[PDB]
Write a protein that binds this ligand. Sequence first.
Ligand SMILES: O=C(C1CCN(c2ccncc2)CC1)N1CCN(S(=O)(=O)c2ccc3cc(Cl)ccc3c2)CC1
Ligand SMILES: [Ca+2]
Length: 223
Amino acid sequence: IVGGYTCGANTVPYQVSLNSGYHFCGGSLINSQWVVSAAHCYKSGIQVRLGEDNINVVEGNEQFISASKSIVHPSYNSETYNNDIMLIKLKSAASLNSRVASISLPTSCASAGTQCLISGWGNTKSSGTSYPDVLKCLKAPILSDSSCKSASSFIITSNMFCAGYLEGGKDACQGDSGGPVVCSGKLQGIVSWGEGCAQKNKPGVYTKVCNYVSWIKQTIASN
Ligand SMILES: O=C(C1CCN(c2ccncc2)CC1)N1CCN(S(=O)(=O)c2ccc3cc(Cl)ccc3c2)CC1
Ligand SMILES: [Ca+2]
């Protein structure tokens, strides 16, 4: 997160960290046994860390649970980033409380202008490199499809949406991938990709979760 602020310990109870010996991606707890993340974050031997704030210090509220099964969207295209979403089932159910809670799936897509909260442990500099140990937060508005497509050098599909600032300075970054974009108490997006970080005229591109609710529900119901 570039240009964001320290969220505050456990103020984002659904935020999870994907670990493979180190933090590499974010994710969202959608129920006691399932996590949603980005397909490009796929990797074998994933361990899900819940209730985290400082990812380098055990503070007492964490839950470390190995992934028993990962499911990349059937139509994920790594070349176009279309359908960049993945589901991860936990070997055992998480113990829900005030610091570990699930986020609701949306029943309708969010409209442009809506204010959303993006969070992650990603790089905090648009040029240099500096990874925080505590969770960073950022408030950002969903942009209109036209300005989104207009700003992007690549093709924006109907399964993506832009959020952020055209004036640069605030954006998600390397390490934030797979993380949540929550608006009005609903998970509306997944940190997917961008052309650099917080560059002027280059907003963040996110997976539009409202288009996958049916796939998500059917999948967890049958697995
Ligand atoms: O420009 C790129 C790729 C981004 C993905 N990509 C395409 C190509 C064709 N169609 C769609 C996407 C090819 C170029 N990168 C530079 C920025 N890095 S990053 O710093 O790790 C990064 C990762 C995720 C991000 C997510 C957001 Cl939401 C905003 C900035 C982000 C920046 C990722 C690769
Ligand atoms: Ca910790």
